[PDB]
Design a binder for this molecule. Structure first.
Ligand SMILES: [Mg+2]
Ligand SMILES: [Mg+2]
Ligand SMILES: [Zn+2]
Ligand SMILES: [Zn+2]
Ligand SMILES: [Zn+2]
Ligand SMILES: [Zn+2]
Lengths: 162, 162
DNA sequence: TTGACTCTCTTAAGAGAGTCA
DNA sequence: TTGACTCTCTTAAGAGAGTCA
């Protein structure tokens, strides 16, 4: 098993490498009609990505290190959380982008939470629009708003009451 | 089936059958510390379900009718919307439960919207807590709340800014 | 040990279609 | 014609593991 020291060294090498990813300034809605700025550290679009990084899917990457002759591999956004519990309330913990930018590996834009909590941030009104997330959102969710519902509740007859 | 008359006949037959489903009263959060009551028309847990209905998954059903001597079949919650566009913005339209109760087939608890709009209602604060859905929610979403995030954004070094 | 590819899987909101009697 | 089962699929937020040089 990897020791605490070895895990800390993986986290540190990951941070060193991600800290050299291009830093892109994004203007984002915060809710309440306010605009803010996020600084995303974006993995390149194509190889090479950075030492230890490889693309396993269109927007999926992994980080790999060999320690004492054993190959270890992690989801590329999971590395900041290697010293944290991997499950909570029965559910697996997932890396969750507060900036909603998959290529971003800025650990200040990531949290570690259930997939339901992760998904729900997509619709959050944002830190200046009523976010109630205990770990606060950094921006209004990209899918927040009135929606585009095609047809609402309706009946042709009188068989139903709401 | 193809004709408008045939489709209206399908909707009317579906409404008559679902209208005989047991009516279950559910007391629900509305947001803003308020509570309301919904009357769900719940498909039975086991066969028989009702004329034209059959279970294709743990919480999936289908409605089928024989028209022009051929079997026509639909997802059981899609029938109210057979005269509506089946896509929006290039996204598939889905039956979406405003009561978040899959066994319910009350068309006054259903809308027709993209899967993203559908999902997002799970986290809505509700009609008395700030719902901004143009087709308004009937209740606060079951996943609304602070969440249970295990770890928030963090770095070990000084490579990153928010 | 490392890079750059390859493959399939999970979840929870939703689907279509085939086999029998 | 109708009923009661069977199977796999879609999406968009996330995953694990293999091959080859
Ligand atoms: Mg997310
Ligand atoms: Mg829904
Ligand atoms: Zn970011
Ligand atoms: Zn939030
Ligand atoms: Zn209902
Ligand atoms: Zn709503």
């Amino acid at each position: 098993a990897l020791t605490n020291a070895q895990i800390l060294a993986v986290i540190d090498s990951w941070e060193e490498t991600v800290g050299q990813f291009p830093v892109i300034t994004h203007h984002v809605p915060l809710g309440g009609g306010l605009q803010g700025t996020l600084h995303c550290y974006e993995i390149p679009l194509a190889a090479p990505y950075g030492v230890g990084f490889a693309k396993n899917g269109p927007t999926r990457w992994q980080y790999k290190r060999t320690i004492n002759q054993v190959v270890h591999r992690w989801g590329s956004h999971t590395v900041p959380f290697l010293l944290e519990p991997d499950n909570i309330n029965g559910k697996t913990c997932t890396a969750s982008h507060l900036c909603h930018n998959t290529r971003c590996h800025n650990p200040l834009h990531l949290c570690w939470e259930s997939l339901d909590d992760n998904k729900g941030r997509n619709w959050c009104p944002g830190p200046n629009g009523g976010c109630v997330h205990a770990v606060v959102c950094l921006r209004q969710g990209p899918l927040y708003g009135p929606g585009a519902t095609v047809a609402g509740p309706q009946q042709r007859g009188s068989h139903f009451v709401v």
